[PDB]
């Protein structure tokens, strides 16, 4: 009751064990260094930034380059205890990343900016 139907010999499947290391190769996990305080460096305070603050309900920040929109949004929410509608990002020709964080309609970007220190 064992007949080869096909004329091709394939390599039979064999057991593949999961690793059970006798020691971790690293004593401790590497600490995350792109935390919320490292994500937002400082708010941009320029005439265009002030226009965005007072007209678009948008805060302008300079952020880390490796940060993405999800990380920037979460970091802003945690640092300033606020809600974010959306985040647009660009990388400036000097290499810094600039983020326009549009806040929720129920939040006044002017009051929040005053709390932060700008305007």
């Amino acid at each position: 009751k064992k007949i080869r139907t096909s004329p091709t010999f394939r390599r039979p499947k064999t057991l593949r064990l999961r690793r059970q290391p006798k020691y971790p190769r690293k004593s401790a996990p590497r600490r995350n260094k792109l935390d919320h305080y490292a994500i937002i460096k400082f708010p941009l305070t320029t005439e265009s930034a002030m226009k965005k603050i007072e007209d678009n309900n948008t805060l302008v920040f300079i952020v880390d380059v490796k940060a993405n929109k999800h990380q920037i949004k979460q970091a802003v929410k945690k640092l300033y205890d606020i809600d974010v509608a959306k985040v647009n990002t660009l990388i400036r020709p000097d290499g810094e990343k600039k983020a326009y964080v549009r806040l929720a309609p129920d939040y006044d970007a002017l009051d929040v900016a005053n709390k932060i220190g700008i305007i």
Partner: protein, 111 residues
Amino acid sequence: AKIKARDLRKKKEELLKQLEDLKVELSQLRVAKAASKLSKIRVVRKSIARVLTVINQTQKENLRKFYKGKKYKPLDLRPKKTRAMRRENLKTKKQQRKERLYPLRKFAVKA
């Protein structure tokens, strides 16, 4: 009255709390960027460095106490002299018998 490592030598949660306070202070200083605050930027940065250094040293000394006596330990807890040094007095019974039967003698001449 800055932060000094001896005063930090404390539980992990309290050290993390102090680190978070320092991070908030540094963020406020960067937003502010007066002469006094512009000077405080470096003080707060070095205090952050000091607290993190104390945290890492405490963690690694605890890890070294933990893995002491174990045959296998993480590579960073293993001595790092030099790749060549990490890669002697055994004798065969024949050589041992040769040394025992014919040891080097202490002798003087012309006496």
